[PDB]
Amino acid sequence: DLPKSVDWRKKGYVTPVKNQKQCGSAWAFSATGALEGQMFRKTGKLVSLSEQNLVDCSRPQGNQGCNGGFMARAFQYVKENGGLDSEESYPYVAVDEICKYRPENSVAQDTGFTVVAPGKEKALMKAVATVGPISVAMDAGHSSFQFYKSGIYFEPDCSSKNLDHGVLVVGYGFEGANSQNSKYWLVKNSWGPEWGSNGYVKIAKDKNNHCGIATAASYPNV
Ligand SMILES: [Cl-]
């Protein structure tokens, strides 16, 4: 059945780490990271997508730009809008601006999104293994996360229910030889390559949905 490990970065599904800077747009980076991987799966072409397009244009769907938002509202906006522009055509500036969506510059589409059963790490494992990178929310409100550097992240004060940060699960794995021991979720952050481990963090896997990684997972349908 399911592989002992997955890493979509090794198959060309993931763009290099990005930096949201001083703007609460992590939800937008998480949504573009999931759409980048589904579009790569569908066309074989990896194209960086515009977080700014989401920040400026998805207020009608319930997002609030640099004040926060949700990946599912972003996929709903891509669906209702009929498209989403490339990173190159609609560059990121980390401030709320006027919607400048240009259909001629669109390089992605989705028909809606699929939800992972909430709180179910095994359902999340199956989604990651068979679909590609998955958008997820997590409790990142801790100094231990801010200064994380390496190893399997584990924070006693983490919540599986009150989440404040959107990220992207690009795979899962384990340390050592036993595939069922010291497992982790491979997670792409949006605080620059300089943060954490080359912009990534290993989050403890199958330890009671630590930090809520499987509480609100979803992926776009392309
Ligand atoms: Cl969401």
Residue numbers in the entry: 1 to 222
Paper text:
The pattern II group (binding shifted to the non-primed side) consisted of structures of nine protected peptides and one non-protected peptide that all bound uncleaved into the non-primed sites. Electron density maps of the peptides enabled the unambiguous interpretation of residues from P3–P1. The nitrogen of the amide protection group at the peptide C-terminus was bound approximately 3 Å away from the ND of catalytic H164. The amide likely shared a hydrogen bond with the deprotonated His residue. At P4 and beyond, the features of the electron density maps became weaker and less precise; however, it was possible to model the peptides KPKKKTK, RLSAKP, GNYKEAKK, and EVCKKKK up to P8 in the averaged kick Fo-Fc omit maps. MPD molecules were bound to the primed sites of all structures. Peptides from patterns I and IV bound to cathepsin V consistent with the observed protein cleavage sites, whereas the peptides from patterns II and III did not bind according to their cleavage site found in proteins. Their binding appeared to be biased by the absence of the negative charge of the reactive site Cys, which caused a shift in binding.
